[PDB]
Amino acid sequence: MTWNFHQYYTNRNDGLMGKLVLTDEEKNNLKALRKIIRLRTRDVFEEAKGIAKAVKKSALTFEIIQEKVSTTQIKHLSDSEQREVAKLIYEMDDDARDEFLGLTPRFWTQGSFQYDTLNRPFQPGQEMDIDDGTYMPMPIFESEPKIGHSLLILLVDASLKSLVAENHGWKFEAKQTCGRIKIEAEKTHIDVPMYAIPKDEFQKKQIALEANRSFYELDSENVNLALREGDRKWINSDPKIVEDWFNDSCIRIGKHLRKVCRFMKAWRDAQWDVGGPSSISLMAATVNILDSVAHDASDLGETMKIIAKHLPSEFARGVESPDSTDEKPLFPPSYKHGPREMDIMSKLERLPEILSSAESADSKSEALKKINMAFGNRVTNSELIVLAK
Ligand SMILES: CN1c2c([nH]c(N)nc2=O)NC[C@@H]1CNc1ccc(C(=O)N[C@@H](CCC(=O)N[C@@H](CCC(=O)O)C(=O)O)C(=O)O)cc1
Ligand SMILES: Nc1nc2c(ncn2[C@@H]2O[C@H](COP(=O)(O)OP(=O)(O)OP(=O)(O)O)[C@@H](O)[C@H]2O)c(=O)[nH]1
Ligand SMILES: Nc1nc2c(ncn2[C@@H]2O[C@H](COP(=O)(O)OP(=O)(O)OP(=O)(O)O)[C@@H](O)[C@H]2O)c(=O)[nH]1
Ligand SMILES: [Mg+2]
Ligand SMILES: [Mg+2]
Numbered sequence: 001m002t003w004n005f006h007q008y009y010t011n012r013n014d015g016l017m018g019k020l021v022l023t024d025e026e027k028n029n030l031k032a033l034r035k036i037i038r039l040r041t042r043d044v045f046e047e048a049k050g051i052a053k054a055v056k057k058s059a060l061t062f063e064i065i066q067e068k069v070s071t072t073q074i075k076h077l078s079d080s081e082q083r084e085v086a087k088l089i090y091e092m093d094d095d096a097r098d099e100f101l102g103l104t105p106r107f108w109t110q111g112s113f114q115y116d117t118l119n120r121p122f123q124p125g126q127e128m129d130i131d132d133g134t135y136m137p138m139p140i141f142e143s144e145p146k147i148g149h150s151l152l153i154l155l156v157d158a159s160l161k162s163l164v165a166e167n168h169g170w171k172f173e174a175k176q177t178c179g180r181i182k183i184e185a186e187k188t189h190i191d192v193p194m195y196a197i198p199k200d201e202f203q204k205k206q207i208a209l210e211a212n213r214s215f216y217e218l219d220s221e222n223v224n225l226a227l228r229e230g231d232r233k234w235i236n237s238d239p240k241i242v243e244d245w246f247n248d249s250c251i252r253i254g255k256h257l258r259k260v261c262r263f264m265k266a267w268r269d270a271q272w273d274v275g276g277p278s279s280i281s282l283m284a285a286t287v288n289i290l291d292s293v294a295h296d297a298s299d300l301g302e303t304m305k306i307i308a309k310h311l312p313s314e315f316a317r318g319v320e321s322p323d324s325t326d327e328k329p330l331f332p333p334s335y336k337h338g339p340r341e342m343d344i345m346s347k348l349e350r351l352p353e354i355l356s357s358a359e360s361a362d363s364k365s366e367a368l369k370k371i372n373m374a375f376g377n378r379v380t381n382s383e384l385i386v387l388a389k
Pocket of ligand 5: 130131
């Protein structure tokens with residue numbers, strides 16, 4: 001016997017796509033959460049600019065500034081953090097202060113929510129992730145921006161911490177590249193990386209944008225990611241580079257690319273409760289395979305076998321980042337594998353065996369059980385599986 005799994009993979013009700021794609025409850029929940037973070041962040045910046053405006057108009061003592069700070073949403077930072085914000089506002093000169101009073105944070109989501117590969121989480125501890133970047137248009141800087149790294153990080157933190165203080169079961173986490181709100185009971189977190197971008201170009205592009213529509217991309221090397229730990233405060237990491245690479249890959253390869261990428265992530269979620277290869281390494285390897293190996297989009301069962309066969313080789317050679325400015329590969333080459341990478345290799349080598357043995361199982365029932373060794377017990381309708389012609 002030979003079974004075909006195309007429907008097992010693609011059926012939008014019962015099949016794997018059916019199990020992975022967010023419910024509307026989940027999708028609207030994520031957008032509502034993002035809206036709440038965006039609102040609070042703009043409010044907090046307005047509150048801080050309010051104080052700075054006061055400083056400009058009349059010379060206010062440091063103590064008066066502290067007092068004013070302690071009355072705003074910034075009160076949700078620790079005591080020493082509040083004093084630091086007051087100190088930073090008190091201490092900036094006319095020029096920096098004028099820049100600050102002209103700053104309004106802007107937002108743009110990146111990651112799987114943006115390019116539509118966000119899967120419903122599988123094991124306990126696994127969470128849906130929305131990556132909403134905050135952008136701070138300021139003058140081009142070589143060393144350090146007019147408005148300080150410290151100040152900007154503190155305000156975004158205050159915004160996030162102020163929301164946690166208003167929501168049972170939310171908690172704040174600081175990561176190296178973002179601030180995070182975790183909502184365990186909803187299996188969700190929102191990440192907020194922060195970027196500096198050129199103010200003049202931002203304005204020019206926004207003016208162009210609004211004039212040319214009725215009812216754009218910045219210079220990549222000036223998109224600066226703020227880093228929270230380490231002595232390097234900023235790194236040139238433009239998230240649009242990955243978004244564009246993936247969207248262009250989808251165009252070039254076809255619409256089955258997003259599906260097979262979801263499947264590989266689902267495989268990952270089933271094989272490890274935490275850990276496994278990154279989502280981006282899986283996408284990059286999969287793109288490389290589909291660009292170079294003949295396949296048929298009308299049988300994702302066959303396509304998934306083709307991918308599984310070639311993944312070990314991709315990862316063994318090291319997976320290069322689509323961002324050539326990246327300082328490391330997305331996955332190291334095999335001569336540099338330690339325990340972590342060896343564990344990944346051994347699971348990848350297992351996958352094509354699982355898919356093969358499912359294909360040659362004795363019944364539809366046994367076929368389902370076998371293939372569910374790769375993706376977990378998510379699909380339950382064995383009648384999705386069809387005897388190959
Ligand atoms: C990213 N970006 C970027 C660029 N270039 C390079 N080289 N790297 C970059 O990272 N260019 C554009 C952008 C950076 N510049 C901008 C960033 C944000 C905005 C802005 O007005 N954001 C809106 C939200 C837009 C939105 O919801 N958008 C929705 C999409 C629309 C929708 O879903 O309705 C969303 O977040 O999903 C806001 O702040 O309220 C305007 C410009
Ligand atoms: N240049 C570069 N950007 C990265 C890297 N890892 C993550 N990013 C950026 O961060 C965004 C989100 O990354 P992840 O959350 O790991 O990946 P995801 O595609 O959202 O996957 P899931 O959250 O697992 O669904 C990506 O779209 C990239 O913009 C990396 O190694 N190099
Ligand atoms: N621009 C840019 N953004 C990134 C990059 N890496 C991560 N991000 C963003 O910051 C978020 C958190 O990044 P990470 O520190 O990689 O998160 P993580 O290590 O996967 O999470 P844990 O495994 O729980 O520590 C991501 O989801 C992205 O939104 C990067 O290289 N460039
Ligand atoms: Mg993500
Ligand atoms: Mg994230």
